[PDB]
């Protein structure tokens, strides 16, 4: 199927409590595979998935050098943005970066990504052309004009179309037994009386990978979007995910309700009912 690689960087200032912390994590699809934390006793890039362990010392050392340099760069960035927004040195602020590459089912590049945010709001993004920028405000325009002068977009394009895809394809092969295995949800419906005339129907999906899933309720074949409580998809801790959707129904009308499940791991969408 389709696959992606992403790095997620968080840099957070903390006046009075030392220099800004830098954390980086890397994912292939919904599987984390590395981490780096500048607050670690001995900061170094660490494996977080079994299939990355086979990478040699040069891989780990080169990663660590990159992240240690980044730690310093983001400290410069935090200082710069503080100034661009005329902010006090007293406050704590966060820069985040997200970047990586998406492949289609045939392993070809679909598109690249490279976005940044300040205090949780979009700041600057590389456009899909991998050539031009979108700046959120006049502060980010300062960054834009700078990055334009230094031809940053060209460097990011070269990475996203080159190393990004090459390393992703490699990880996909080395981790093929898990990364290219979809685990379908285990599904069931539970029934919980609320009162004499109403009951909750809850449609469960458990043990699935990847996280993407569609879980809905219909009444007489019509979607119940407004009346469905749908919890965020949540990690089980064993690589898999969980989700449920619930409706409150009139007692006796349970068989008018059907829960519909779509997941890449399923040949065809599933239809479930409460089974007393």
């Amino acid at each position: 199927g389709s696959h992606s690689m992403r790095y997620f960087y968080t840099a957070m200032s903390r006046p009075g409590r030392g220099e800004p912390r830098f954390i980086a994590v890397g994912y292939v699809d919904d599987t984390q595979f590395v981490r780096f934390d500048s607050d670690a006793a001995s900061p170094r890039t660490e494996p977080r998935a079994p299939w990355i362990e086979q990478e040699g010392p040069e891989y780990w050392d080169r990663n660590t050098q990159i992240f240690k340099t980044n730690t310093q760069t983001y400290r410069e960035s935090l200082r710069n943005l503080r100034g661009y927004y005329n902010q006090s040195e007293a406050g704590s602020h966060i820069i985040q970066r997200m970047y990586g590459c998406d492949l289609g089912p045939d392993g070809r590049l679909l598109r690249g990504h490279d976005q940044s945010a300040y205090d949780g709001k979009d700041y600057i993004a590389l456009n899909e052309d991998l050539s031009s920028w979108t700046a959120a405000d006049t502060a980010a325009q300062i960054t834009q004009r700078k990055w334009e002068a230094a031809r940053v977009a060209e460097q990011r394009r070269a990475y996203l179309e080159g190393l990004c895809v090459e390393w992703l394809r490699r990880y996909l092969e080395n981790g093929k037994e898990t990364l290219q295995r979809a685990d379908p949800p285990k599904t069931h419906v539970t029934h919980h009386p609320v009162s004499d005339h109403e009951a909750t129907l809850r449609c469960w999906a458990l043990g699935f990978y990847p996280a993407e899933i569609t879980l809905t309720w219909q009444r007489d074949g019509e979607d119940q979007t407004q009346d469905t409580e749908l919890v965020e998809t949540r990690p089980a801790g064993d690589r898999t995910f969980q989700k449920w959707a619930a409706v409150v129904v009139p007692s006796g009308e349970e068989q008018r309700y059907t829960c519909h499940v779509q997941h890449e791991g399923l040949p065809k969408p599933l239809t479930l009912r409460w089974e007393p």
Binding site: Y7, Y9, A24, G26, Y59, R62, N63, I66, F67, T69, N70, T73, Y74, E76, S77, N80, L81, I95, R97, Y99, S116, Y123, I124, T143, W147, A150, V152, Q155, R156, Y159, L160, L163, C164, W167
Partner: peptide, 8 residues
């Protein structure tokens, strides 16, 4: 494998 960064 990660790319490099640059100051904002």
């Amino acid at each position: 494998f990660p790319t490099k960064d640059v100051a904002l």
